[PDB]
Structure 1
């Protein structure tokens, strides 16, 4: 549907006319609905769960990662998550990198503090590192499942008028999805800008904004971690140890 507007000035009978197409306003309104974005995120998570299900991966993720002996399931789960994220970024390639190897880490002695899934080149083939105890500690941590994070009127008006997926399981799925999303961002910088840039990014995540917004911000969908604005409680007080009398002329990351 189209809406027409007419402007008339008091010096003549001239009328200048413009046509507005309502679809743009409808799209903005739909993008402003909380239920719409919630449905988008939940549909992404549901597609992830369905993708795991068709790969027999019905067992809870914590149970999958708790099995030390069976490495094939862990490798398949991580590879499938990487492929799902890759398809989300590029909705044209259904198969991930056709050949890559997996190594599972069970020791702190060879563990990376903060990047549980890491990628490296052995001069012959891609290799992916999986820190199994880190993922186990992530998924096994007790979750806050009774607290409320900030409509009562619609509830009042209403009052006057089969796979068993618990909340813990869904939170575990989302946790693994976000972790593999971080790993995939690192891997994307790797594959597209070299090992040097990948190891530069491992120590400074601020290069993501420059090496993603050039291509991803205008071609792919929205990232899962962008659904909410995350901040550290009392960040300024803790950061007060490292304060600079700064002069920022290349503040490329607000």
Structure 2
């Protein structure tokens, strides 16, 4: 599919005619450029909106100090609730509330800690309840790990790839803002299960928690173009080393 598009032009009364030919390879490339810029802008906008909305809530102090404290019961709940609502609106822009019954539990002890899924639910022992590991959330915010950006990429070809090299009060650190994406993703994952069980029974919910695998069926006729935070999809690691 190299498609050296081929063209000709004629004088009326067909005295004589001229030929030219051309190549999409510039046009598709510019299309890709525009696409990625567009979607990047959209995502950035979304994040900004989220951050500002949280900012509204009159926090006395920078985020991390909150969870570094453990005496709170209001702020943390508020945070969680806000994130959940944001996600739900991201899928149902017309929808605004969950009809009460939402309640939270702080968890503080390893002897209450649970691997993987850090936020957990009992949809109705009479009513919904949730559980959260603040200690772990601090561990996930073991912020020290962060560092300046690496610039790696793979499958290069030439400036066929590189052509973008020629294609044209909380005033606070980008990296600390970036930490928010962590909780975003976490609550997103949780919202998956919450939605699943809210739609269906408990045992399949347990099965999904056993393996986040069988989801791929039921999570269908479900994303009616409501894109979610998996843009740069090359999520992969060394495989052959599993060695059973």
* CA distance in 2: counterparts of 1:73 and 1:231, whole angstroms: 40
Tell me the CA shift for residue 50 of structure 1: 1.1
Q: Deviations over 1:102-157 (max 9, x none)?
A: 00000111111111111113421110111110101111332332242399999999
Deviation at 1:159, TM superposition (A): 13
Shift of the alpha carbon at 1:190?
1.1
The superposition leaves residues 76-105 of structure 1 with CA deviations (integer Å, 9 ceiling, x where unpaired) of 100110110111111111224532110000
Which residues of structure 2 form unaligned runs of 5+? Answer: none
How has the CA–CA distance of structure 1 residues 18 and 170 changed in structure 2, closer, same or farther, with 3 Å as cutoff? farther
Gapped regions of structure 1 (runs ≥ 5): 237-253
Conservation of the 8 A alpha-carbon contact between 1:3 and 1:21: yes
- State the TM-score, normalized to the length of structure 1: 0.70
Cα separation, partners in 2 of 1:11 and 1:229, compared to 1, 3 Å: farther
- The 1:189/1:156 distance shift into structure 2, 3 A limit, reads closer
CA 1:154–1:227 in structure 2 vs 1: closer, same or farther (change >3 Å)?
closer
Q: TM-score, normalised by structure 2?
A: 0.72
The farther-off stretch of 78-87 and 159-168 is 159-168
Q: Is the 8 A contact 1:86 1:96 kept in 2?
A: no
Q: Distance in 2 between matches of 1:220 and 1:165?
A: 29
Query: Do the aligned partners of residues 17 and 167 (structure 1) sit closer, same or farther apart at CA in structure 2, a change above 3 Å counting?
Result: same
Q: Hey, which of these two has a bigger chunk of helix by percent?
A: 1
Give the C-alpha shift of residue 36 in structure 1. 2.0
Q: CA deviation at 1:29?
A: 3.1
Contact kept, 8 Å, 1:60 with 1:169, in 2: the verdict is no
Offset of residue 214 of structure 1: 2.5
| Number of matched pairs | 237
Assess if the C-alpha contact under 8 Å between 2:67 and 2:134 holds in 1. Answer: yes
Asked whether the equivalents of residues 4 and 19 of structure 1 are also in contact (C-alpha less than 8 Å), the reply is yes
- 2:163 corresponds to which residue? 157
More moved, 172-181 vs 63-72: 63-72
Label 1:227 to 1:54 Cα distance change in 2 as closer, same or farther (>3 A). farther
Return the offset for 1:44.
1.7
Tell me by how many angstroms 1:40 deviates: 1.8
Consecutive aligned runs of 4 or more in structure 1 exceeding 6 Å deviation: 1-28, 150-161, 227-233
- SS of 1:227's equivalent in the other structure is coil
Deviations 1:156-198 (A, max 9, x none): 9999996223133122210010111111111111101121111
